[PDB]
């Protein structure tokens, strides 16, 4: 029966608790209500940002922008981990499987939620207190100007579906419970959970959006472009370190 | 039973029937050859270089290059078959002509491996309209670059064939792969999306009616496209290696057009 909604409300509740900056709060900053946010659009507005913005992650500018993204990546992984532990059935699985689920999942979820803080002209940074210009992100050089641009192109198409947090909570739960991650020992319970999650997502979309026919299908189709983005991201992550203090190097992966 | 559904089910019958008249070797006949139904003859199995020279006498230099350029002519013939099917998808021939070729350009490869799964089990693949069967371990035993082409399709086919789709489901699923709006360089995307919505609505109904005991087969089938597009990327990466390894070997012009990223 419609017990699916008890699941939908449960995960949305944990979504609000795990993630401080929600999508509704991010579009309001983006759109405009408020109390604004610092805008970084060139080289000098960057150095002023490190004085007024909340940059807690610090001698060349294109590298420091990449290090800051890597710093918040490991921040998001902790928030994603806490939310996964609230997905019913997750903590009861094999412990090795929980690791590999998160190991191969956090990237797809990072960029899914990055689209929430991204308009067509830039991205919100530092819990919405700053806004880095998209044109300034391609401004970079060598390999850096392209690391963020393919995600803008993804965010534009993903945001056109106009999903809210109640939809995204179930969606990312479906991503974590992917039974096709390499090295899984017990796939059956993972697929059993994800199927229960897909049922929840299909009912959520048809209820929340009688607008969009087959929006469930289109959202599933985005998981294709969501693994192509993660593929070419690590394709860039090895071109950077093929070029360019082991204790910060150990903090990151 | 309702006019909403009657529309989509008539659309399913239409696609299923163009499917039959576009593709000579259905999955139903393939499964008959591969398991051993009396409705079909039995293939000649090729597992080493010895049984290869015997296929010439039964079924219609450099052996590693040979199997590949027979793969090429097979892909060419299927692109023709895929095109004939695409012309039957309601609305497709009414979309912009350069968008028509854009859908086919990025579409044929994803269709090929879907239909290639119908000719496969875990042990090998049917070849030459079902008269032959080339074992999977013989294909790996091939030369240093050529031994790597086929096994990714084998890994996908076994996971994909586990969905247990029959030709009725594939006809609609193949139709939704051709008509997708995210392919690059598309001029007008909205008419393409309006047709795909119809096709996916037809697939959703067809899967729930044909496979009513399989929970959420619609969702699991759609995510198999992430597997298809990675196979295409691995394939392209092997084509740029062979193009510089064997600079004496030719590639078909038709596939040389799908051959641009
Ligand atoms: O006339 C000759 O001498 C000839 C030689 C070898 C083959 C074997 O070939 C196939 C034949 C039928 C069905 C499938 C294949 C094999 C393949 C692939 O290996 C492949 C790889 C990528 C896309 C499509 C295909 C495909 O259809 C065919 C003809």
Author numbering:
A (entry chain B): 208 to 240, 243 to 267, 275 to 460, 466 to 474
B (entry chain A): 204 to 263, 275 to 475
Please give the exact wording used by the authors of the publication that reports this structure.
To exert its biological effects, PPARγ depends on ligand binding, which induces conformational changes in the receptor’s structure that lead to a dynamic process of corepressor dissociation and coactivator recruitment. Through this process, PPARγ activates the transcriptional machinery and regulates the expression of genes involved in several metabolic processes, such as adipocyte differentiation and insulin sensitivity.
The 2.7 íresolution structure of the complex between PPARγ and AM-879 derived from co-crystals reveals the canonical fold of the agonist conformation of nuclear receptor LBDs. The most striking changes were in the loop between helices H2 and H3. The electron density map presents three regions in which we could fit the ligand in different orientations. In addition, the poor definition of the electron density of the ligand in the crystal structure of the complex PPARγ-LBD/AM-879 may be caused by the limited affinity of this ligand for the protein or may be due to the multiple binding modes that this ligand seems to adopt in the LBP of PPARγ.
